[PDB]
Design a protein around this ligand. Structure first.
Ligand SMILES: C=CC1=C(C)[C@@H](Cc2[nH]c(/C=C3N=C(/C=C4\NC(=O)[C@H](C)[C@H]4CC)C(C)=C\3CCC(=O)O)c(CCC(=O)O)c2C)NC1=O
Ligand SMILES: C=CC1=C(C)[C@@H](Cc2[nH]c(/C=C3N=C(/C=C4\NC(=O)[C@H](C)[C@H]4CC)C(C)=C\3CCC(=O)O)c(CCC(=O)O)c2C)NC1=O
Ligand SMILES: C=CC1=C(C)[C@@H](Cc2[nH]c(/C=C3N=C(/C=C4\NC(=O)[C@H](C)[C@H]4CC)C(C)=C\3CCC(=O)O)c(CCC(=O)O)c2C)NC1=O
Ligand SMILES: C=CC1=C(C)[C@@H](Cc2[nH]c(/C=C3N=C(/C=C4\NC(=O)[C@H](C)[C@H]4CC)C(C)=C\3CCC(=O)O)c(CCC(=O)O)c2C)NC1=O
Ligand SMILES: CCC1=C(C)/C(=C/C2=NC(=C\c3[nH]c(/C=C4\NC(=O)[C@H](C)[C@H]4CC)c(C)c3CCC(=O)O)/C(CCC(=O)O)=C2C)NC1=O
Ligand SMILES: CCC1=C(C)/C(=C/C2=NC(=C\c3[nH]c(/C=C4\NC(=O)[C@H](C)[C@H]4CC)c(C)c3CCC(=O)O)/C(CCC(=O)O)=C2C)NC1=O
Ligand SMILES: CCC1=C(C)/C(=C/C2=NC(=C\c3[nH]c(/C=C4\NC(=O)[C@H](C)[C@H]4CC)c(C)c3CCC(=O)O)/C(CCC(=O)O)=C2C)NC1=O
Ligand SMILES: CCC1=C(C)/C(=C/C2=NC(=C\c3[nH]c(/C=C4\NC(=O)[C@H](C)[C@H]4CC)c(C)c3CCC(=O)O)/C(CCC(=O)O)=C2C)NC1=O
Ligand SMILES: CCC1=C(C)/C(=C/C2=NC(=C\c3[nH]c(/C=C4\NC(=O)[C@H](C)[C@H]4CC)c(C)c3CCC(=O)O)/C(CCC(=O)O)=C2C)NC1=O
Lengths: 177, 100, 161, 206, 160, 103, 160, 92, 160, 161, 161
């Protein structure tokens, strides 16, 4: 797996180059807001036990045939797995927000999830809505516009980390579509 | 209407475009050269001259707000033609009814 | 670039016949009025600037393609319009005299809609402007002459669509 | 004799004409955006929604665009129980307003071919106005929630067309509410009784 | 701006930028702090610069507002001041761009075709911009008034 | 054809729809009960078009222009008096490439 | 035609037709049917006239008819009357559209290289048209043959 | 400078091609067309290919496109290869 | 005139004059008797055609004569009518020349440069010629008023 | 634009090697036919107008492309043919001397079939004119020289097809 | 052809609004780096020939595109390279000063990859040359200035790919 430091290494290995003065301004700006990124992961993992119940139960009130018998959230063992992959996906997105690159997202979480969900018979369009409520929550927590819990922050712009975590959930929602 | 309603939102956007200047020229001193008092030669301006009043009078008076606003005669004419045809074409089917 | 006489001749001898009596009814329509078209082209030459000023004010100048962001915002872009509308009112005058719309697609229509898409010129507002310009042209030249000049305006609007 | 031969004539030539066909500057043969899609026979709802919604004038333009036109199976896949909540309201004939942005989120300024996305994650905002993250890794190029199906289609003005599997909804897009009833308060004395008096706000009264 | 046409100048000549071109891009960006202050003065003085701009314009050209003038009535007079708000805005662009390139391709190229085609006296709108210039230069010091007035008179020159 | 003079203005009344409402009487009804119709015909009784109308273009004449190189589109009259025949014939030719007879 | 010359000639100057040109269209259209009445007179005399043209083009030039000349043989002489038929057909076009373009866009432009690649002596074809004009005078009265006379000798001027 | 100084009808320089090109314009098209000469048969000059595809600038596309039809040409395809659309500043 | 530009047209084309050109020089010189009568009517009606011409011009454009107008006072108003006497004279030339060629290179070529450089509203002088046109066509029959008015409106077209 | 010697030098140069026995073996083969090509190009220059007059009269003289409506009717259009056929007989003469058809597609073939489709020129009648022109060219220059000059005619006919 | 100031003015103008705090916030960010870009463009102008000589010798000097048959064999073809590499190092200098890569695709990128495919120029070796040229450019102008000049090199390499 890679991070934002070693993504530009294996890009600079593709051009047999040293990591010179052109590419280090991309990375010294990355550690310039390194305090901003850790203030963005901390908003995700502090509500991460509550966001997964917020997002799976939002999928149920939209598509209530899952908890209908013969569905895919009917059996109580089968419900407890759907709370688990709401937060394993949130574990691997929060690693991708931490590392700054979506390699660990695209080599461990999405590595075979598409043929998993076919072979378990999981409805894929409801797995999009389980993922995308966590996209609309994490861009509310990182911009601190969640409508019932505000966290304390040193003030300033944060909209690049909001679109970065929205880019990691679309990497998930396209790979399992 | 739902393209007549898009015409009303363009009239509301055209007035907000000019409202910083419409109210900024409302307390200027705009004095003309003729046309108001009869001691000055205005020529045909005395009123308007020889056919130039128009079919209506508003076609007749420029402005951004009016000119897209007399547009409304043309999109509301096509809606009223196909509606009010709904009055009396709900009549042959309305009163054809009691008959069969 | 053929007029009514050129098209009558010209079809006429592409097979090579002589003009028979059936097809001198185009000619006999066209050569009757011939009187109507010149007076129609007379007043249009006089009120060229007045007609274009009436069409844009009745038409897209109230829109908002006129405001910032719209397709007609900058003065170079606004000035290109009345330059552009002048050709439609001018070439339509040529079609009205020649009695044949061959000059329009020869010199106006070809590569026109393909050009406005390149520049990003709104074809919808363009046709409306020509339709409004057709409406004022029927004011000047009269009813039947407006029917003649109007017959080439929508030819431009049809092909430009 | 070297395989990658070249073009030209005279001495120093490999026996191949200039440009591989004697044309230095080749006239293009592609059509524009919307009728390259019209010929494909798969973007039928996409070209029709463009024509109705007036967005099709925008992607007529010569600017280098990267359209992510969804095949109509994507449009046919809009019958999610979930996605039907936020998108069914657009079927109403007055809500063309949101239909243009939601379609304008699929146009990307620039010509991003899939080969240009070799393990690269770059974002951009649409012509709708809000950012979208194009992510190409492991030969799986993504555009929001796209999961692109067909790689690229060369178009007229150096534009590209990618076939996506779903419809990308903009990030801060809220669905329009259904048409409702303008409700008015019955009574007026049930509302003076609903307002706290100043003597209540100081705790002088219950 | 000075940056874009110093480039396209040296672009056409198949060469890079000389010291004469690069010691002025350098000299312009150090001037950039002072330019934003000047444009910041005209930015939130448009209420007075425009309204007093049309003040002297009607006192000097009562024909355009009198009955028969192009800007006659409540309607045209509002648009009569709208154009002055446009040209006052473009001068703020030219001050920050350090050139009339923003004013060139907006409000200057083909301006006579528009105003002739609108029936507006182009000399009258030139009188309006001159009245705005005296109000604008009265809001700034002498070192600044040689700039803010400097862009108006270019607009005066191209507008006739 | 309108051959239903057997069927008057009282066709689709559907007399036997019967609702018992319990053990009491059968409450007979003659509700008309229209279909999931739609009455598929074009060019109905009015125009329903208020403006926004310049849709008309001529048909494609091939390579030529539109409104054809005339000769492939109707003459009638005199052929002439002498007129030697062709004896090669080389195919009939199409939209004549741009330049009419009067080039 | 004549209106086409005015639309073209006014189009390269980017202007509407002037006062004099609109005379030239108006006077041409008022003399409309008289060309139409005249061409029907000539179409009824095409078998009239070309028989008379073959009278004097060959008694003047027996070189072409004799064995060895180009027109020797039946099928060579067969089209020989056909070229008269096309020329006479072209002149009916020119008499109608009151100018020389149907005699010039067809027939005249490049006629020498056509005949020179055919073996027809180009001087002989000039006398053929001059013979054709000599033949048209007999089946036509004095009123209208000087109307059609200037259309013939343009062809002779075009062929030299 | 630019081609829209105030020239129109009744002005001293002759009425001609007026392009909406800005100061030192940097937009250019990629056009394709055939243009038969229609004058070689009385001039007898050598022959040149008439099917050309070339980049014309925005400053003079309109004059060229207005002229290509002057001599009976047909324009098969044109595009705006270099330059933006709806761009207020930056065409220079 | 029609004679001089029908020549210079056929001059440039390396050819003589067609029947279309020579049947109109012919048609123009037989028209010459009627042209001199029309110009003779406007020749000694300049007292009324000009003075009533400036009659409607001031009633329709009081700005130009009001204080501040270009033709203000006893002085400019005299020159205000002088130009109308000029343009009325050129129309008499165009009627006899059968074309606006005399009006073209006198009073039309570069006219906007003069009047813009004199401060005169060019639209105002266009209004003056239109007022003269109604007086001129009121002095002649319908067959003549389609000519005398015909040259004025060309001057109206080129003067804006 | 390469002759047989230019093409031999290019292929021997493009590998960076000298002119070995195989490269000079073809060059000697070209110099042997050098005497034949000049006399072939000699008589073709003399009978240029006669060859084209023979081809058109033998292939497409009386067909209905020659008659009204056909693609060769007007005198401008007929005169363009013999102008057009002159290039085929001329450029084929250049290929016969250079011994390499590179000049044909460089200066004749490219944009040719794409041009005739624009004008609407019948490619079918064009090739048969060149085939008939190839037939008369074998009359003058002989058999083997006709085989050489004929080898470039059908090269034009192949690419023009 | 827009710089950072032109792009900021365009986006602020295209909505018809004034230059608010966000538009001037980026403009202040561009003026801060104005001193860095000129010195970066200063040394690149001085060492233009030295940088291109270093890139070709470091990337594609001895590879078999340089040898016979390779894409760069003949002296005309070799001389076209350093002419060609001069534009990439030159236009990248313009993007570094203007702070906006609009000039590259306007004047370099459009029709570029479509042109190299016509000539048969290897796009793979071309990007490597620009990558090596980007590597030496970071040597001269420093780290952050190399980050700026390097930001437009890969923009060329991306679009040229
Ligand atoms: C490292 C990657 C990784 C993941 C992403 C998760 C996801 C995941 N879930 C399940 C297993 C399951 N996953 C689901 C999930 C769902 N069904 C729905 O309708 C919802 C849309 C969704 C919950 C949000 C269900 C219902 C099962 C139970 C199947 C069963 O027990 O038979 C399995 C198979 C495991 C097994 O049962 O043996 C996996 C791999 N776990 C992982 O290890
Ligand atoms: C039918 C059932 C149903 C629900 C249960 C809710 C569930 C829900 N909440 C949000 C939207 C959200 N959901 C949360 C989640 C939470 N808020 C918190 O503070 C906690 C951390 C956590 C609950 C424990 C947050 C933070 C947002 C963003 C906005 C905000 O609430 O401040 C969204 C996405 C936006 C939307 O589609 O409306 C959904 C579906 N909505 C429904 O339609
Ligand atoms: C945004 C997406 C969207 C929808 C989902 C529908 C939802 C919807 N349906 C109705 C309104 C209605 N809906 C029904 C439908 C039904 N009633 C029944 O008893 C049946 C069980 C069921 C049909 C199968 C009926 C009968 C009406 C009354 C109006 C009508 O019949 O046209 C209304 C108008 C509300 C009102 O005025 O009361 C709305 C918003 N419309 C939308 O725009
Ligand atoms: C008010 C409206 C009304 C009705 C809907 C019927 C309903 C009905 N049927 C029967 C009573 C009956 N109904 C049936 C009929 C049948 N039984 C079967 O097993 C067959 C499947 C079916 C024949 C079709 C029979 C066989 C009897 C019993 C004999 C009889 O009473 O005729 C009874 C009397 C039951 C009792 O004694 O409690 C009633 C109320 N009668 C009414 O008055
Ligand atoms: C940014 C450069 C720029 C300019 C300058 C501009 C001008 C402009 N001026 C207009 C109208 C107008 N302008 C005037 C102006 C005047 N009347 C007077 O007496 C004065 C002399 C003068 C103002 C000082 C009037 C009266 C109208 C309305 C004319 C009408 O309604 O017919 C219109 C049409 C309505 C509109 O869309 O606003 C435009 C587009 N557009 C541009 O993009
Ligand atoms: C519309 C204008 C037009 C013309 C005129 C025309 C002429 C023409 N004349 C031809 C032949 C010919 N034309 C003649 C002509 C003549 N012999 C004489 O003595 C006479 C003076 C003269 C006829 C009046 C002869 C002898 C041939 C045959 C030559 C040959 O093939 O051997 C041919 C070759 C095929 C054919 O006969 O149809 C053409 C095309 N084509 C055109 O498109
Ligand atoms: C004779 C046949 C013919 C036509 C019609 C023609 C059109 C034409 N219109 C152009 C531009 C233009 N055309 C418009 C027109 C409009 N904007 C709107 O909002 C309206 C819908 C419309 C006015 C009706 C504008 C604004 C431009 C400038 C575009 C730009 O600067 O990007 C240009 C680019 C060059 C230039 O104007 O100098 C050409 C070539 N050329 C021709 O040869
Ligand atoms: C034959 C073609 C032709 C024309 C037309 C012409 C015009 C002409 N008009 C002039 C002045 C003038 N022209 C006017 C005209 C007008 N004031 C108004 O309000 C009206 C709108 C308008 C008249 C209807 C005025 C006021 C002056 C004097 C301007 C001054 O003194 O500054 C002058 C300078 C003084 C002189 O030498 O007469 C010339 C040369 N010369 C020519 O050779
Ligand atoms: C050197 C390589 C080369 C060739 C070959 C060439 C061809 C060429 N042939 C042309 C026309 C033409 N070519 C023909 C030819 C024919 N009609 C027929 O029926 C026959 C099948 C055929 C004679 C064999 C005709 C009739 C035209 C005129 C088309 C028109 O006026 O529309 C034209 C249009 C312009 C002009 O002639 O002035 C070109 C450019 N140009 C070149 O540079």
């Amino acid at each position: 797996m890679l991070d934002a430091f070693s993504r530009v290494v294996v890009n600079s290995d593709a051009k047999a180059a040293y990591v010179g003065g052109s590419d280090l301004q991309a990375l010294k700006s990355f550690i310039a807001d390194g305090n901003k990124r850790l203030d963005a992961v901390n908003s995700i993992v502090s509500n991460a036990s509550c966001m997964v119940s917020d997002a799976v139960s939002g999928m149920i009130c939209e598509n209530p045939g899952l908890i209908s018998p013969g569905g895919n959230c009917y059996t109580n063992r089968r419900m407890a797995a759907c709370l688990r992959d709401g937060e394993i996906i949130l574990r691997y997105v929060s690693y991708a927000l931490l590392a700054g690159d979506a390699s660990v997202l695209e080599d461990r979480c999405l590595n075979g999830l598409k043929e998993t969900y076919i072979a378990l018979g999981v409805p894929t369009n409801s797995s999009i809505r389980a993922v995308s409520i966590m996209k609309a929550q994490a861009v509310a927590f990182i911009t601190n516009t969640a409508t019932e819990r505000k966290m304390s922050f040193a003030a300033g712009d944060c909209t690049s980390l909001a679109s970065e975590v929205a880019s990691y959930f679309d990497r998930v929602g396209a790979a399992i579509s | 209407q739902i393209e007549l309603d898009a015409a009303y939102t363009s009239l509301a956007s055209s007035r907000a475009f000019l409202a910083p200047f419409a109210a900024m020229a409302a307390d200027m001193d705009i004095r003309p050269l003729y046309g108001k008092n009869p001691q000055v030669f205005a020529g045909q301006f005395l009123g308007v001259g020889a056919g130039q009043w128009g079919k209506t009078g508003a076609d007749t008076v420029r402005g951004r707000s009016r000119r897209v606003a007399a547009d409304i005669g043309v999109k509301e004419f096509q809606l009223e033609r196909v509606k009010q045809l709904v009055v009396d074409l709900q009549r042959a089917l309305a009163l054809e009814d009691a008959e069969a | 670039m053929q007029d009514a006489i050129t098209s009558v001749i010209n079809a006429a001898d592409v097979q090579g016949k002589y003009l028979d009596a059936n097809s001198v009814e185009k000619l006999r329509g066209y050569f009757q009025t011939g009187e109507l078209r010149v007076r129609a082209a007379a007043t249009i030459a006089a009120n060229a600037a007045t007609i274009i000023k009436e069409a844009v004010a009745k038409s897209l100048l109230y829109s908002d393609i006129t405001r910032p962001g719209g397709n007609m915002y900058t003065t170079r872009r606004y000035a290109a319009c009345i330059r552009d509308l002048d050709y439609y009112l001018r070439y339509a005058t040529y079609g009205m005299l020649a009695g044949d719309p061959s000059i329009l697609d020869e010199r106006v229509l070809n590569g026109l809609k393909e050009t406005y898409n390149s520049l990003g010129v709104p074809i919808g507002a363009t046709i409306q402007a020509i339709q409004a310009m057709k409406e004022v042209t029927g004011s000047l030249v009269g009813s039947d002459a407006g029917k003649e000049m109007g017959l080439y305006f929508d030819y431009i609007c049809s092909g430009l669509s | 004799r070297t395989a990658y031969p070249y073009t030209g004539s005279g001495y120093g030539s490999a026996g191949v004409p200039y440009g591989q066909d004697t044309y230095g500057y080749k006239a293009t043969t592609a059509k524009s955006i919307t009728e390259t899609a019209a010929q494909a026979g798969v973007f039928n709802t996409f070209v029709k929604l463009l024509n109705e919604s007036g967005v099709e004038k925008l992607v007529e333009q010569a600017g280098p665009y990267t359209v992510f036109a969804p095949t109509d199976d994507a449009f046919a896949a809009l019958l999610e129980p979930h996605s039907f909540n936020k998108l069914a309201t657009l079927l109403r004939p007055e809500n063309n307003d949101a239909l243009r942005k939601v379609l304008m989120h699929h146009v990307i300024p620039g010509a991003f071919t899939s080969a240009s996305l070799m393990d690269r994650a770059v974002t951009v905002k649409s012509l709708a106005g809000e950012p979208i993250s194009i992510m190409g890794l492991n030969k799986l190029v993504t555009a929001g929630t796209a999961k692109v199906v067909r790689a690229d289609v060369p178009c007229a003005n150096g534009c590209i067309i990618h076939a996506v599997s779903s419809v990308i909804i903009p990030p801060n897009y809220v669905p329009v509410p259904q048409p409702t009833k303008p409700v008015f308060p019955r009574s007026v004395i049930a509302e003076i009784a609903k307002l706290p008096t100043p003597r209540q706000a100081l705790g002088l009264d219950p | 701006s000075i940056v874009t046409k110093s480039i396209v100048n040296a672009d056409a000549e198949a060469r890079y930028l000389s010291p004469g071109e690069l010691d002025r891009i350098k000299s312009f960006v150090l001037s950039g702090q002072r330019r934003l202050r000047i444009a910041q003065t005209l930015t939130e003085n448009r209420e007075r610069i425009v309204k007093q701009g049309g003040q002297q314009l009607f006192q000097r050209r009562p024909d355009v507002v009198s009955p028969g003038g192009n800007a006659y009535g409540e309607e045209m007079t509002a648009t009569c001041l709208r154009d002055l708000d446009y040209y006052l805005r473009l001068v703020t662009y030219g001050i920050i761009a350090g050139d009339v390139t923003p004013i060139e391709e907006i409000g200057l190229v083909g301006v006579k075709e528009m105003y002739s085609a609108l029936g507006t006296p182009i000399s009258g709108v030139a009188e309006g911009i001159r009245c705005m210039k005296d109000v604008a230069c009265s809001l700034l010091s002498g070192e600044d008034a040689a700039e803010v007035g400097f862009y108006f008179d270019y607009t005066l020159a191209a507008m006739q | 054809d309108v051959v239903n003079a057997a069927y008057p203005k009282n066709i689709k009344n559907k007399a036997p729809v019967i609702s018992f409402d319990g053990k009491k009487g059968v409450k007979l009804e003659m509700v008309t009960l229209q279909t999931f119709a739609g009455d598929d015909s074009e060019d109905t009784l009015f125009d329903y078009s208020s403006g926004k109308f310049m849709p008309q273009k001529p048909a494609d004449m091939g390579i030529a222009w539109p409104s054809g190189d005339g000769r492939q589109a109707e003459m009638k009259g005199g052929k002439g008096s002498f007129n030697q025949p062709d004896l090669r014939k080389y195919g009939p030719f199409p939209d004549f490439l741009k330049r009419s007879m009067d080039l | 035609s004549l209106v086409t010359q005015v639309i073209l000639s006014a189009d390269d100057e980017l202007r509407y037709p002037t006062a004099g040109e609109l005379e030239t269209i108006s006077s041409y259209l008022k003399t409309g049917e008289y060309r139409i009445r005249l061409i029907s007179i000539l179409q009824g005399k095409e078998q009239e006239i070309i028989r008379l043209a073959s009278k004097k083009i060959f008694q003047l030039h027996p070189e072409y008819i004799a064995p060895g000349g180009n027109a020797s043989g039946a099928r060579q002489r067969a089209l020989c009357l056909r070229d008269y038929g096309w020329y006479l057909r072209l002149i009916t076009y020119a008499i109608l559209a009151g100018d020389k373009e149907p005699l010039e866009k067809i027939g005249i432009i490049g006629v020498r290289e056509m005949y020179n690649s055919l073996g027809v002596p180009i001087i002989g074809m000039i006398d053929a048209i001059k013979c054709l004009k000599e033949a048209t005078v007999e089946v036509i009265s004095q009123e209208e043959e000087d109307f059609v006379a200037p259309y013939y000798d343009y062809i002779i001027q075009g062929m030299s | 400078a630019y081609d829209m100084d105030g020239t129109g009808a009744g002005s001293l320089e002759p009425r001609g091609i007026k392009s909406s090109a800005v100061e030192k314009d940097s937009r250019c098209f990629k056009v394709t067309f055939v243009l038969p000469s229609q004058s070689r048969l009385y001039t007898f000059r050598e022959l040149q290919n008439v099917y050309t595809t070339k980049m014309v600038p925005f400053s003079s596309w309109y004059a060229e496109q207005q002229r290509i039809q002057k001599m009976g040409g047909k324009i098969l395809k044109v595009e705006l290869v270099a330059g933006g659309q709806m761009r207020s500043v930056g065409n220079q």
